Tab-separated table of N, CA, C and O in Angstrom:
chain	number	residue	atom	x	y	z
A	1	UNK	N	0.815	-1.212	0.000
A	1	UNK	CA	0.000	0.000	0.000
A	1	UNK	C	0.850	1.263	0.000
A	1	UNK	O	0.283	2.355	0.029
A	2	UNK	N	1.956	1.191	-0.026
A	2	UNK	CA	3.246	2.537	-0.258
A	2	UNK	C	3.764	2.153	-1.354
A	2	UNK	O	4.152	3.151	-1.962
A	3	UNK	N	4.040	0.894	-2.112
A	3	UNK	CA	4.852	0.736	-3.074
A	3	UNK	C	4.191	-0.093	-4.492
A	3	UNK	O	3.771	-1.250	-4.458
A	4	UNK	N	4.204	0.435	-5.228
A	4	UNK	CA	2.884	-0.115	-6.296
A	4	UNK	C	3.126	-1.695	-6.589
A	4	UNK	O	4.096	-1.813	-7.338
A	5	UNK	N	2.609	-2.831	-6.270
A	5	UNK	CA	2.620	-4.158	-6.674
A	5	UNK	C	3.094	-4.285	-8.352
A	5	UNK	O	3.033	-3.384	-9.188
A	6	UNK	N	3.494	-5.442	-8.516
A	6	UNK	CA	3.755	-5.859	-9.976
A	6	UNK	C	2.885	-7.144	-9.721
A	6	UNK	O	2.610	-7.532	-8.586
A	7	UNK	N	2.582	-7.609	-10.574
A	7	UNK	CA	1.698	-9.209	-11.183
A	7	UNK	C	2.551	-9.364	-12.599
A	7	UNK	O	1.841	-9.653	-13.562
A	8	UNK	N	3.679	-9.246	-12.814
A	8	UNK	CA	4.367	-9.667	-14.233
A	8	UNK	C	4.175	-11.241	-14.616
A	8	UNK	O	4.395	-12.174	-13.843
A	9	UNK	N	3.802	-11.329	-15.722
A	9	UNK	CA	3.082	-12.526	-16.618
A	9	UNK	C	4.173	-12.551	-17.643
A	9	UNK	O	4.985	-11.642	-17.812
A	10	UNK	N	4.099	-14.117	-18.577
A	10	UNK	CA	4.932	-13.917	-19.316
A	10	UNK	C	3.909	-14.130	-20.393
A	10	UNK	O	3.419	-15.228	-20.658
A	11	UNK	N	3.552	-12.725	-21.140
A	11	UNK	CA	2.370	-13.062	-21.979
A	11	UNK	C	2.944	-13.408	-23.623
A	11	UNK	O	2.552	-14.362	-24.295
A	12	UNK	N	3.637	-12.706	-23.922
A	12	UNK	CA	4.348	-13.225	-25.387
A	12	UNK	C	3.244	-12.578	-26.363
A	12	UNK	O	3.133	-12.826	-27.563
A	13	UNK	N	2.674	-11.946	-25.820
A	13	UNK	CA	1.679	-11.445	-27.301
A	13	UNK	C	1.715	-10.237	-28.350
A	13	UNK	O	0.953	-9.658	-29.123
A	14	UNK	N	3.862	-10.171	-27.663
A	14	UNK	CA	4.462	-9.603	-29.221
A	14	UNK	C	5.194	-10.659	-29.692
A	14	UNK	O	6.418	-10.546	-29.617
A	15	UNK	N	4.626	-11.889	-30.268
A	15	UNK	CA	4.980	-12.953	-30.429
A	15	UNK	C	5.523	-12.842	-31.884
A	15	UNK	O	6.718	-13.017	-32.122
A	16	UNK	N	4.573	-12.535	-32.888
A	16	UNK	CA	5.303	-12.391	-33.879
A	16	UNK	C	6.333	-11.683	-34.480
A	16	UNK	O	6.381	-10.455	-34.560
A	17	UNK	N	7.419	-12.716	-35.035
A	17	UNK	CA	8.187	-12.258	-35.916
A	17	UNK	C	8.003	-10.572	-36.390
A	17	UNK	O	8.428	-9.549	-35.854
A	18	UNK	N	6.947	-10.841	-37.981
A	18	UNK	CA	7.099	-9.711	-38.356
A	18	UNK	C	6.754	-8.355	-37.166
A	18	UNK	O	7.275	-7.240	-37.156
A	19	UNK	N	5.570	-8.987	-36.101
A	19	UNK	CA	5.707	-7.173	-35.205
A	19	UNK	C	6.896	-7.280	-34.791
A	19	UNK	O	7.510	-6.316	-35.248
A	20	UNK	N	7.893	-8.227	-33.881
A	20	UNK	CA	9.337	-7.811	-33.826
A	20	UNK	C	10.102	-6.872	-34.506
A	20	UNK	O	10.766	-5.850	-34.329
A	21	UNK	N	9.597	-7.921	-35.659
A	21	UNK	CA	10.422	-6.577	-36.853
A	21	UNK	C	10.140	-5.208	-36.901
A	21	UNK	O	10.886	-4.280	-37.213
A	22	UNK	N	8.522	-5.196	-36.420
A	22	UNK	CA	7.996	-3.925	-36.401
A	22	UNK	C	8.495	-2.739	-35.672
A	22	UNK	O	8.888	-1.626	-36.022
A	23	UNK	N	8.312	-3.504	-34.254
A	23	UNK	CA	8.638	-3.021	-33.141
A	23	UNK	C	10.512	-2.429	-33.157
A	23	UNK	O	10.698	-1.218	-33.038
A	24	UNK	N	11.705	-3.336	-33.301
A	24	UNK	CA	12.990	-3.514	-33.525
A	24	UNK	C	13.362	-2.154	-34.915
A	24	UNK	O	14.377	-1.458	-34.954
A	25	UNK	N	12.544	-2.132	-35.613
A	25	UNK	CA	12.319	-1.411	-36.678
A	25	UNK	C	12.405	0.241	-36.560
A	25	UNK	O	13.283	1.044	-36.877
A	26	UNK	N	11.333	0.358	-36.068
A	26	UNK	CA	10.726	1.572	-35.421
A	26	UNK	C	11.052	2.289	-34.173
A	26	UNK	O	10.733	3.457	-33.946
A	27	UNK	N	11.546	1.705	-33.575
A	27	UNK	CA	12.169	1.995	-31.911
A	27	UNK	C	12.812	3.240	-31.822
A	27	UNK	O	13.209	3.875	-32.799
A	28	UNK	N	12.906	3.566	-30.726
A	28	UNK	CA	13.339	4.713	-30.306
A	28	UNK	C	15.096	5.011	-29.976
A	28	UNK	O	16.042	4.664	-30.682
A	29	UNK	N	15.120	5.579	-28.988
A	29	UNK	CA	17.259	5.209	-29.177
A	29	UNK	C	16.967	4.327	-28.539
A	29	UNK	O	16.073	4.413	-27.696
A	30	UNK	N	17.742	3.075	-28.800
A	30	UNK	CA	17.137	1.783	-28.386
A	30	UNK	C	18.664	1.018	-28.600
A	30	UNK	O	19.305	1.940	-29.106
A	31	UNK	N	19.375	0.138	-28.522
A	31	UNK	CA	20.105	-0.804	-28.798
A	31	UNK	C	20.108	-2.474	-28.632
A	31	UNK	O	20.941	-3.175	-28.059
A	32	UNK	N	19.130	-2.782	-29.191
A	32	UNK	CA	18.480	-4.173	-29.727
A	32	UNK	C	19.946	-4.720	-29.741
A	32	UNK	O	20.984	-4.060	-29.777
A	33	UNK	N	19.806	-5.955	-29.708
A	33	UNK	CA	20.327	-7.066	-30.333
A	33	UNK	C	20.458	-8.226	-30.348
A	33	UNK	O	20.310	-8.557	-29.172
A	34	UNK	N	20.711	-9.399	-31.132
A	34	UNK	CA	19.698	-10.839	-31.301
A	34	UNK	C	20.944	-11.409	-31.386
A	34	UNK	O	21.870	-10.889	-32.007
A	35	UNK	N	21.038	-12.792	-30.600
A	35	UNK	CA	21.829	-13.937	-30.643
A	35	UNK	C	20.735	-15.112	-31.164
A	35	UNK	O	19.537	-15.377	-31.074
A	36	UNK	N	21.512	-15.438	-31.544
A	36	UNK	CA	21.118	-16.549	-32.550
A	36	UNK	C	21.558	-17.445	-33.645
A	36	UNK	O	21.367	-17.535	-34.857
A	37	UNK	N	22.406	-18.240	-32.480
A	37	UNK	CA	23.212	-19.568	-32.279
A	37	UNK	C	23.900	-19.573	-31.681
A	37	UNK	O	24.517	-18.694	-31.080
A	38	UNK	N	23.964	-21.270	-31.749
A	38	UNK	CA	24.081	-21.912	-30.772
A	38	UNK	C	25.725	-21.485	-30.161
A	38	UNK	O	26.517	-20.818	-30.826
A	39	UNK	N	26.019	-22.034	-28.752
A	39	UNK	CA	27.069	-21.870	-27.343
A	39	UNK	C	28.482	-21.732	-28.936
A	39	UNK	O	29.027	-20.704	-29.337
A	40	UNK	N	28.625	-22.877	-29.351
A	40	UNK	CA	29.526	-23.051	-30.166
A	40	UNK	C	29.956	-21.973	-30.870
A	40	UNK	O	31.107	-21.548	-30.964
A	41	UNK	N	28.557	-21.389	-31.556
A	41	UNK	CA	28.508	-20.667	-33.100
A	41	UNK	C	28.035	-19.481	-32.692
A	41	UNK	O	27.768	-18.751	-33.647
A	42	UNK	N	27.840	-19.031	-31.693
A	42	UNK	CA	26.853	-18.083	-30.815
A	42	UNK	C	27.445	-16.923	-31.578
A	42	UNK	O	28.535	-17.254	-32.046
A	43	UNK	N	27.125	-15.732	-31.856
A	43	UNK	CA	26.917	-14.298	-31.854
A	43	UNK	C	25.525	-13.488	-31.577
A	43	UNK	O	24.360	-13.825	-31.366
A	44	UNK	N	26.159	-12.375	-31.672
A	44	UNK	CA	25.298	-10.815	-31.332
A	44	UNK	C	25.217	-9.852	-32.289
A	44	UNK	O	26.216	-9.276	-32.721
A	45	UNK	N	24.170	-9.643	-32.636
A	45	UNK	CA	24.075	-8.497	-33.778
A	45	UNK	C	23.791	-7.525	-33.264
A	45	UNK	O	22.581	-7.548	-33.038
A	46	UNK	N	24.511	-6.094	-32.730
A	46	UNK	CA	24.137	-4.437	-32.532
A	46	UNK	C	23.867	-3.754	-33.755
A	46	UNK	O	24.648	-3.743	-34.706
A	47	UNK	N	22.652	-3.130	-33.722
A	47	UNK	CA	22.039	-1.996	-34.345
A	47	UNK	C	22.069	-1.093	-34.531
A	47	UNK	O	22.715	-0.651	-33.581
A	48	UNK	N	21.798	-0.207	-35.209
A	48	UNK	CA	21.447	0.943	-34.523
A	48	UNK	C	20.322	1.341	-33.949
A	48	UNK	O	19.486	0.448	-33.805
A	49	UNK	N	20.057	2.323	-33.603
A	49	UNK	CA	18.854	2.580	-32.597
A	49	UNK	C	17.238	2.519	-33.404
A	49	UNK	O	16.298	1.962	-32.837
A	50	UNK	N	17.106	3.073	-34.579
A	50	UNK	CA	16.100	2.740	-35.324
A	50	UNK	C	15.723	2.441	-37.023
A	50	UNK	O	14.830	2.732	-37.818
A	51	UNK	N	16.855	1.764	-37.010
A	51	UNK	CA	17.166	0.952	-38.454
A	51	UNK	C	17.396	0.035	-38.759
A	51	UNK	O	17.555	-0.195	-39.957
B	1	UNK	N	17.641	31.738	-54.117
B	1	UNK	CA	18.868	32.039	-53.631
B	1	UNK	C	18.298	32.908	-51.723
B	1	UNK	O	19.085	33.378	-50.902
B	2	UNK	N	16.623	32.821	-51.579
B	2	UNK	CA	15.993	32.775	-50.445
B	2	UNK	C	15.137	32.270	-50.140
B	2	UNK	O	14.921	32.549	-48.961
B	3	UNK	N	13.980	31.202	-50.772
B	3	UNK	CA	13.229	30.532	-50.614
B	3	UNK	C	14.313	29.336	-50.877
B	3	UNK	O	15.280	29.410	-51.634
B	4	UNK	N	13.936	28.239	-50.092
B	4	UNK	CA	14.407	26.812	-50.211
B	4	UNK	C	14.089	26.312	-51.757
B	4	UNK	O	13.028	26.545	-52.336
B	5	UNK	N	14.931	25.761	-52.180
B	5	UNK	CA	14.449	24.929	-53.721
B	5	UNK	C	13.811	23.302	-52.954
B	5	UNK	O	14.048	23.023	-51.778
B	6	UNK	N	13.254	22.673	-53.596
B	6	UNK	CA	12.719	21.401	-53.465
B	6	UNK	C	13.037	20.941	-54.963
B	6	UNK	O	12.846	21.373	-56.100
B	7	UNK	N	13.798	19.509	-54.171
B	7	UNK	CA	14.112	18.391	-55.681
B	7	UNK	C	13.200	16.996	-55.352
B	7	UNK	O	13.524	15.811	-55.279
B	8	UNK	N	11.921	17.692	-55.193
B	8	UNK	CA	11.290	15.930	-55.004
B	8	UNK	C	11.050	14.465	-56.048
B	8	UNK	O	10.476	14.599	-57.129
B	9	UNK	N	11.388	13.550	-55.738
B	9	UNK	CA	11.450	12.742	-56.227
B	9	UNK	C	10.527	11.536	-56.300
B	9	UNK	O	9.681	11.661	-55.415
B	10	UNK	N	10.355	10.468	-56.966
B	10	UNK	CA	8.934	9.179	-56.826
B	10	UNK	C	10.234	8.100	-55.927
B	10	UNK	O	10.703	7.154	-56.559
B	11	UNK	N	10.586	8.292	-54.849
B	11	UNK	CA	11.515	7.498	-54.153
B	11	UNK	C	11.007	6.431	-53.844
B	11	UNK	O	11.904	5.590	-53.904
B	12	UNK	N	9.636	5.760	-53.403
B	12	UNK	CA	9.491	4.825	-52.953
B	12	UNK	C	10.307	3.724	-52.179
B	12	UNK	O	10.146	2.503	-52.200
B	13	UNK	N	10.887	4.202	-51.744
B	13	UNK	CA	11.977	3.515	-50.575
B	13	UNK	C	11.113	2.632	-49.289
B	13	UNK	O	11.698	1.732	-48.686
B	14	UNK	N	9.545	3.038	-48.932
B	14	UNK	CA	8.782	2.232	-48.601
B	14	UNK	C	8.251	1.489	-49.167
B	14	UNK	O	7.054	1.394	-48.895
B	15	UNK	N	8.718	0.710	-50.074
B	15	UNK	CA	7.985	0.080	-51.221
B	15	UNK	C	7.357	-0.997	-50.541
B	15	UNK	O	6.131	-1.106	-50.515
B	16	UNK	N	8.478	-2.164	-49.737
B	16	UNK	CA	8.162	-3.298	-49.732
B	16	UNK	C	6.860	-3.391	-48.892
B	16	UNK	O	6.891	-2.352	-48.233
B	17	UNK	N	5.625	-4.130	-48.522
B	17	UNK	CA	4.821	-3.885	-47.802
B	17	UNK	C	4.399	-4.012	-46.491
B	17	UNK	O	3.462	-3.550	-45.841
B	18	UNK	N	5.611	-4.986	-46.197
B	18	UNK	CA	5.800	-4.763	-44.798
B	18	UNK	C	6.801	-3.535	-44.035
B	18	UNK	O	7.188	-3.406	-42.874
B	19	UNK	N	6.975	-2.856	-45.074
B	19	UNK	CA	7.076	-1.473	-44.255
B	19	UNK	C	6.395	-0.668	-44.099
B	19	UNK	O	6.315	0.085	-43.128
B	20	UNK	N	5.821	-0.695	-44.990
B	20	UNK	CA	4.724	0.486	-44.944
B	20	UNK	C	3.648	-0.312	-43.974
B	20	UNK	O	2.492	0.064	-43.775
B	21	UNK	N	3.943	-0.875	-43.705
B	21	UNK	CA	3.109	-1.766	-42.217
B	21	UNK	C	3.791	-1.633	-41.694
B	21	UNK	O	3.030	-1.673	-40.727
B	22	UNK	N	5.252	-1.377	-40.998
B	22	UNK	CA	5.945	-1.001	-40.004
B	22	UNK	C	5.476	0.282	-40.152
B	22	UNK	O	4.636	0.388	-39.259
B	23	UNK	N	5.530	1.388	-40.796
B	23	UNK	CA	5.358	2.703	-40.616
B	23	UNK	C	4.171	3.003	-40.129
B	23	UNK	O	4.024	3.894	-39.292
B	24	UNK	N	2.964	2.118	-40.716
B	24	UNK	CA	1.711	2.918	-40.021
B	24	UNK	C	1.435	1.699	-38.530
B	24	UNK	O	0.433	1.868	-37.834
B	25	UNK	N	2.041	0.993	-38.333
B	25	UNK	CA	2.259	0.378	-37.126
B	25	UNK	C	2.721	0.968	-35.966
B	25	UNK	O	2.117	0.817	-34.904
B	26	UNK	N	3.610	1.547	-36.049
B	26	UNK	CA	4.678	2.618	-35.191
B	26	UNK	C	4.574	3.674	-35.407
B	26	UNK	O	5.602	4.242	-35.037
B	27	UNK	N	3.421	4.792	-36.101
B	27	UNK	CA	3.602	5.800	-36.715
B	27	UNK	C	2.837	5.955	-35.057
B	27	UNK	O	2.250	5.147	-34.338
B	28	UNK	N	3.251	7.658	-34.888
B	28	UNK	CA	2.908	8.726	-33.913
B	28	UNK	C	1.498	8.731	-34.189
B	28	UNK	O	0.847	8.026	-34.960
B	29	UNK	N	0.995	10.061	-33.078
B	29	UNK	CA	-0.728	10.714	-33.257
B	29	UNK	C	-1.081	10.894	-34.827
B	29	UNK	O	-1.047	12.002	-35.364
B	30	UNK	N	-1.392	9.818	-35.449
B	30	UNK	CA	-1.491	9.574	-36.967
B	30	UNK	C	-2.984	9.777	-37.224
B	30	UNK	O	-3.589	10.161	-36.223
B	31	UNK	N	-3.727	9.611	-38.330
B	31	UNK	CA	-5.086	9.156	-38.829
B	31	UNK	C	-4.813	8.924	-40.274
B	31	UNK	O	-5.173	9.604	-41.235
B	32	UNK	N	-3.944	7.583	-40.234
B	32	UNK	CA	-3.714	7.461	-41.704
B	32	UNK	C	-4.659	6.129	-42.238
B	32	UNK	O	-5.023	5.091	-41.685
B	33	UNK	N	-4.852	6.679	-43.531
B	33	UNK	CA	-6.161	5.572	-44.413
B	33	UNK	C	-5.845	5.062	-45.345
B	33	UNK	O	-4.812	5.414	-45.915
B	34	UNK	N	-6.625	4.060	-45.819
B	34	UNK	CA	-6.658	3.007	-46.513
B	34	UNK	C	-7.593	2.532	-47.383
B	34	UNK	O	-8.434	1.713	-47.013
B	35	UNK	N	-7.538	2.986	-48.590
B	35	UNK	CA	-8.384	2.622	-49.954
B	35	UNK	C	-8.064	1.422	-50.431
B	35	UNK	O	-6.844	1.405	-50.598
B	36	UNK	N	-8.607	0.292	-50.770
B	36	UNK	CA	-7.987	-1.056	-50.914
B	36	UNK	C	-9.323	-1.285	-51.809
B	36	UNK	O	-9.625	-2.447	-51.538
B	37	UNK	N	-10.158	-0.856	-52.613
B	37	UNK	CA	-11.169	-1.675	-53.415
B	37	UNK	C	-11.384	-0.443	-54.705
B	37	UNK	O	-10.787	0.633	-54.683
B	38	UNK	N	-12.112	-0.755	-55.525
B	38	UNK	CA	-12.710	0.007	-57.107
B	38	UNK	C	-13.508	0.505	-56.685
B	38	UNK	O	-13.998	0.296	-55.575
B	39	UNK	N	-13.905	1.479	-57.671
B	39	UNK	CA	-15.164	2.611	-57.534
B	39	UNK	C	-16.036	2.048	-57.122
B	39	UNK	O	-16.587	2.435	-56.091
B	40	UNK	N	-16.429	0.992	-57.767
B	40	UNK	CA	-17.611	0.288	-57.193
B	40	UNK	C	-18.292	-0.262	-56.004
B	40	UNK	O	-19.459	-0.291	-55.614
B	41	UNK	N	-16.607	-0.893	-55.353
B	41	UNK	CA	-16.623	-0.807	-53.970
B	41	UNK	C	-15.801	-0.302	-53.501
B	41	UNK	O	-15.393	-0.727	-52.420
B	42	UNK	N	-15.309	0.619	-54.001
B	42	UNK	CA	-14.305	1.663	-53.431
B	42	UNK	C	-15.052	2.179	-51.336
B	42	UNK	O	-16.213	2.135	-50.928
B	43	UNK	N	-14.320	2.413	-50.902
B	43	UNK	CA	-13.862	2.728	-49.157
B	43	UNK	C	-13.012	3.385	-48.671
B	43	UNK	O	-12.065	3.919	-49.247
B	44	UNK	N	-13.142	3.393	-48.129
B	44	UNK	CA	-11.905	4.159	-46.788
B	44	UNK	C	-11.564	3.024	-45.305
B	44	UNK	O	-12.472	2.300	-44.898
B	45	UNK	N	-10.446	3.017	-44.763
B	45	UNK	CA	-10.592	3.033	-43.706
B	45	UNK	C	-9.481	3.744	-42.243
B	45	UNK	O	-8.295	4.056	-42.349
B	46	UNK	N	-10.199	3.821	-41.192
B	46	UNK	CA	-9.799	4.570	-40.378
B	46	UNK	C	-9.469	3.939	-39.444
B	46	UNK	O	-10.332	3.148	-39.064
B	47	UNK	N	-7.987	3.953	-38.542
B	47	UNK	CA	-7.669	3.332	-37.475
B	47	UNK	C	-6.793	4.299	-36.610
B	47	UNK	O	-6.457	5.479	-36.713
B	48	UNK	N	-6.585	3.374	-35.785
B	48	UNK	CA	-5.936	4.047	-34.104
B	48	UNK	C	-4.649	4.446	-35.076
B	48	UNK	O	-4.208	4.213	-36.202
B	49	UNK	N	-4.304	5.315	-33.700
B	49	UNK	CA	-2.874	6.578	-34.669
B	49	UNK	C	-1.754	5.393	-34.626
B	49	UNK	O	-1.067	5.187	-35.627
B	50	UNK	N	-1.612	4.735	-33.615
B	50	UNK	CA	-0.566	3.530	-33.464
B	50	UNK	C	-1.208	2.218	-33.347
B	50	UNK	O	-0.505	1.785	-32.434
B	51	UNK	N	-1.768	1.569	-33.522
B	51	UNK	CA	-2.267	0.494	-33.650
B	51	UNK	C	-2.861	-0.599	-34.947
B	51	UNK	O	-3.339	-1.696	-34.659
């Protein structure tokens, strides 16, 4: 009652791909970036902020 | 040599169509529309400024 509660869910209902893209796309100064592969082969792609 | 010149161009650089679905996806306090049929059934439509 002094400190505002959270209830965080893991809803996923920016699930799709293309809104990712949307969202990742459009963003604000932002610095995204996606791994994607595997421990072995692993990297990181940095962005820029809305391109 | 005191008014600005303008060199506008047919750039279409939003061509592909999922940008121009990123743009009116992410676009600001917008009211942008959408004609998608012939005279016959020609329309409009109207949506949320970001949504």
């Amino acid at each position: 009652y002094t400190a505002v509660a959270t209830t965080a869910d893991v809803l996923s209902a920016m699930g799709s791909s293309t809104a990712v893209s949307t969202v990742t796309l459009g963003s604000g100064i932002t610095s995204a970036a996606v791994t994607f592969a595997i421990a072995t082969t692993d990297s990181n792609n940095t962005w820029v902020d809305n391109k």
